[PDB]
Amino acid sequence: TCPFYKKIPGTGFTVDAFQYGVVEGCTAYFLTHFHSDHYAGLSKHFTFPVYCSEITGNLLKNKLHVQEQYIHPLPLDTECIVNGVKVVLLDANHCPGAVMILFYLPNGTVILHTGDFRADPSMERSLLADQKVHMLYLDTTYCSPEYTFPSQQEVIRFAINTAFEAVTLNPHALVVCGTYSIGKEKVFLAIADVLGSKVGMSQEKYKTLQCLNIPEINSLITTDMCSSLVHLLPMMQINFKGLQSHLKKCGGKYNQILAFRPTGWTHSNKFTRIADVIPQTKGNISIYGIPYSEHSSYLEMKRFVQWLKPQKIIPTVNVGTWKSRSTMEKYFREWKLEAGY
Ligand SMILES: CC(CO)(CO)NC(=O)Nc1ccccc1
Ligand code: NI
């Protein structure tokens, strides 16, 4: 049974609701982005209209084999009519192809669904500036003040300098980067670029990256592992055992691994500055956890909401516990009283 927070009232629309069978009343299914918790339930046998971005549509077609007749891609920043309702898709600053959705209801209500997002001040000058928003369906992943992390720019600078230093000291070191979904591509692309290498990866991952409309991509990635000194592996393999095993496979070309695990937030954010981050080391293998987030920090979230001044907020993350729900509602009220709406 589809939960209430995935239905858009006064419409036949649902958001990220593919795991409930046929939803009674739903005439169009929106998908905000291609992450598994959100697409869960889609496959080649799905026979209802799906509305999404061009990039999400590319992945639906090539990775899940959804038939082309049921895929409805929409351009961003453009007023579109779907089943008699005006909608707009906006960039969510999450992973590639991720969108927020503005719904203009027939009765005059305006609803914004953020999907998954990392709030940014640049959103204050999108088509959101034009009009009032009555209800906000909010990505509340990190809705608590202990959740702090640096900018994406600062984290990339750290990773570039770290990788460049290690490989300039030892030209026989290999760099490995972990992945388990789309998003955070800048980590491995920035490192390969400073080292003058293409990024090497499996055929399955190369296929996924070929759907993302990244400029000049054929210049940046490859399935020829032997030609590359930056390798991608599954996140599960980024450990001392998995990396030792991978080093064996490279045929004595390398004598050292430097590896990166981009995580979200970790409790080591509560003590240590990004400049001060150190690896875990065992012999000739070092592993860095870096706090590269594609969700809003607490402060970024607060700023966005206080700018938008919604009349009602519906959380879409951390909704399963009463303690979480009570915590989030307290912050929403604090933000409202501070700003004065
Ligand atoms: C009605 C409900 C549950 O309390 C639905 O999630 N939440 C809100 O709308 N609370 C809210 C508080 C301050 C500012 C704006 C909204
Ligand atoms: Ni996501």
Helix/strand number for the chain, H first, E second: 8, 18
- Work out the number of other CB atoms within 10 angstroms of the CB of residue 23: 18
Distance 116 CA to ligand 2 centre (A): 5
148-295 CATH pick, 3.90.700.10, 3.40.50.12650, 3.40.50.150, 3.30.160.20: 3.40.50.12650
Question: What technique solved it?
Answer: X-ray
Which among 55, 53, 47, 51 has a CA at the least distance from the CA of 21?
47
Tokens of 35: 């992450």
Best substitution site from 313, 335, 341 to test ligand 1's pocket, by max atoms within 8 Å of Cβ? 313
CA separation for the pair 239, 244 (Å, rounded) = 8
| Size (the chain), residues | 341
For this experimental structure, what is the resolution in angstroms?
1.8
CA separation for the pair 179, 188 (Å, rounded) = 10
Q: Which amino acid residue places its CA nearest to atom 15 of ligand 1?
A: 312
**20-28: Cβ within 8 A, 24+ apart:** 22/48, 26/2, 27/83, 28/72, 28/82, 28/83
Ligand 1: residues whose CB is within 6 Å?
310, 312-314, 329, 332-333, 336
Distance 331 CA to ligand 1 centre (A): 10
Backbone dihedral angles phi then psi of residue 177, each to the nearest 5 degrees: -125, 135
Question: Which residues lie below 8 Å from residue 104, measured CB to CB, with a gap of 6+?
Answer: 85, 86, 87, 110
Distance (Å) of CA 106 to CA 9, 10, 80, 103, 109: 11, 8, 14, 9, 7
Q: Ligand 1 atom closest to Cα of 310?
A: 15
Return the ligand number nearest the Cα of 333. 1
Best substitution site from 4, 311, 312, 327 to test ligand 1's pocket, by max atoms within 8 Å of Cβ? 312
Beta bridge partners of 14: 7, 29
Q: Where are the domains of the chain?
A: 1-147+296-341, 148-295
Q: DSSP letter for 118, please.
A: -
Handedness of CA 174, 245, 235, 58 (dihedral sign): positive
Return the ligand number nearest the Cα of 56. 2
Residue with tokens 């007023």: 79
Which CATH superfamily hosts domain 1-147+296-341? Ribonuclease Z/Hydroxyacylglutathione hydrolase-like (3.60.15.10)
Which among 134, 88, 132, 139 has a CA at the least distance from the CA of 116?
139
Q: Ligand 1 atom closest to Cα of 312?
A: 9
Backbone dihedral angles phi then psi of residue 334, each to the nearest 5 degrees: -55, -45
Which among 173, 164, 167, 196 has a CA at the least distance from the CA of 243?
173
